[PDB]
């Protein structure tokens, strides 16, 4: 009765560790692209247009139809829909690095997707939630969070690019140091997520939601790859586009759900972003292993 709270110690630690992860991953990845190739990919919107069209025309529609045909409740359908309309993430960049893709297309694709999310999230949210949500959902959108995510994506990559271009020697040392610190932050994130999933087992969720969260990333990957192939794209550009379409951001969904509904209405969905990220990581690792095995053979 006195405390009434006290869940801060682990959540803030996880947030700061993930922020350090993102900063250092962008640092280590900004030495793998060139500014000239970035503007070459930007001036030609073939990849950008396909990625944006897929992410904002098929993923929201896929989430909506999955929620409608899977007989999901209002809160579960809202969660899956907000996850569907979210922009791409940086796991997409990491996977593209590990899938031998065009990293000059990855950063431009992610930045354009995030800006288009700032522009289009209220629109898609209103259109697809006029049925499953009586109130307005346009206000709950975290514009400031998206803006700071854009800043945190751009600044480390920009400084890494200018460091590699001007001082090649410093690049190797900072890359090695970033890898070293990421190695420990990885075990930190792993143990924190292990505790979170251990508690999520006790506070279990709807298994239909689990099926939908498993189906969504695979459908995203397949549809992105098919759309890129049908548009006569390059071999590595196809993989980059598919891997960017498959991976979505889940922090925005958590923020929107927390703002829109009381904690007791969310309930089991407190660990939905963790489950979605776990499914994304598992399917992406499986696809990466399959691609590497095919390439070696």
């Amino acid at each position, epitope marked *: *009765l006195p405390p*009434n*709270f*006290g*869940k801060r110690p682990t959540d803030l630690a996880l947030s700061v560790i993930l922020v350090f992860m993102l900063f250092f991953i962008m640092l280590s990845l900004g030495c793998t692209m060139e500014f000239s190739k970035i503007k070459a990919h930007l001036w030609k919107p073939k990849g950008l247009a396909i990625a944006l069209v897929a992410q904002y025309g098929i993923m929201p529609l896929t989430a909506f139809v999955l929620g409608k045909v899977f007989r999901l*409740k*209002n*809160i579960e359908a809202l969660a899956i829909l907000v996850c569907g309309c979210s922009p791409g993430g940086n796991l997409s960049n990491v996977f593209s690095l590990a899938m031998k893709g065009d990293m000059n297309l990855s950063i431009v694709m992610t930045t354009c997707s995030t800006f288009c999310a700032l522009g289009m999230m209220p629109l898609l949210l209103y259109i697809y939630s006029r049925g499953i949500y*009586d*109130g307005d959902l346009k*206000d*709950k959108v975290p514009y400031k969070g998206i803006v700071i995510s854009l800043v945190l994506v751009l600044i480390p990559c920009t400084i890494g690019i200018v460091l590699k271009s001007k001082r090649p020697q410093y690049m190797r040392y900072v890359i090695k140091g970033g890898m070293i610190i990421i190695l420990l932050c990885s075990v930190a994130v792993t143990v924190l997520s292990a505790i979170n999933v251990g*508690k999520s087992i*006790m*506070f279990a969720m*709807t298994p239909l939601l689990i099926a939908t969260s498993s189906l969504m990333p695979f459908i995203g990957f397949l549809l992105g790859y098919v759309l890129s192939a049908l548009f006569c794209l390059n071999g590595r550009c196809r993989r980059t586009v598919s891997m960017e379409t498959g991976c979505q951001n889940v922090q925005l969904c958590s923020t929107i759900l927390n*703002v*829109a*509904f*009381p*904690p*007791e*209405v969310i*309930g*089991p969905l*407190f660990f939905f972003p963790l489950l979605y990220m776990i499914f994304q990581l598992g399917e992406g690792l499986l696809l990466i292993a399959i691609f590497w095995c095919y390439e070696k053979f």
Partner: antibody
């Protein structure tokens, strides 16, 4: 010691309007949603709506959207419900409620108000 | 909106008789919760998430069920249990309460 204070009874005339108040003390006001519940003598409990003191977001009942209107004054840490066009079927007891709920440390607790016996007089 | 029906509407039991009250919804309810109201007082949360107990609730109260059928069981009813019990869902808006079950004392 969370405590929500409400008036005892407010007699009104049919077709008029009333503004019920709920004053909170003993907890961070902008940390939990405030819900409003209606209890008619003879029927069961009904849920009117919710309001977030720190954001102002409001979910309402389908049948109480055109009748109730929740407001918040964080300066005095007070919540308000404005009832309008009060017919004879609006005589009930109105409670203001807050629910402390954590799934991290799984636990739940309620804090209700004593109620406000609104009776249309005529 | 989900409509809940609570049975029985009125009951009588002895101080020690095992008692069970049922609530059946009109649609799939993901969790169900129970509220206790003593006469001349405001309702209080009693059991949430179909199995848990709020602060101050004695260990004699338990909950069970799923789908569209849930139940509240008291093993050894005492003299301080004559009240009104309501079932409540807050997972499918709008939130709805049950009709109410009046548990009295037999003599």
């Amino acid at each position: 010691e969370v405590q929500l204070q409400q008036p005892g009874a407010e007699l009104v005339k049919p077709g008029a309007s009333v503004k019920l108040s709920c004053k909170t003390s003993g907890y961070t006001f902008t940390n939990y949603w405030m819900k409003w519940v209606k209890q008619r003598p003879g029927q069961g409990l009904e849920w009117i709506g919710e309001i977030n003191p720190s954001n102002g977001g409001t979910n309402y009942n389908g049948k109480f959207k055109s009748k109730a209107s929740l407001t918040v004054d964080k300066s005095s840490s007070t919540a308000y419900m404005q009832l309008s066009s009060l017919t004879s079927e609006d005589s009930a007891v109105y409670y203001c409620t807050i629910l402390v709920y954590d799934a991290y440390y799984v636990f739940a607790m309620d804090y209700w108000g004593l109620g406000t016996s609104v009776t249309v007089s005529s | 909106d989900i409509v809940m029906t609570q049975s029985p509407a009125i009951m009588s039991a002895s101080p020690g008789q095992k008692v069970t009250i049922t609530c059946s919804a009109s649609s799939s309810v993901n969790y169900m919760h129970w509220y206790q109201q003593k006469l001349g007082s405001s309702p209080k949360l009693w059991i949430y998430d179909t199995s848990k107990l709020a602060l101050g609730v004695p260990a004699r109260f338990s909950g069970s069920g799923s789908g569209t059928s849930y139940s509240l069981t008291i093993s050894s009813m005492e003299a301080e249990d004559a009240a009104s019990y309501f079932c409540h869902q807050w997972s499918s808006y709008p939130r709805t309460f049950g009709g109410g079950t009046k548990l009295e004392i037999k003599r």
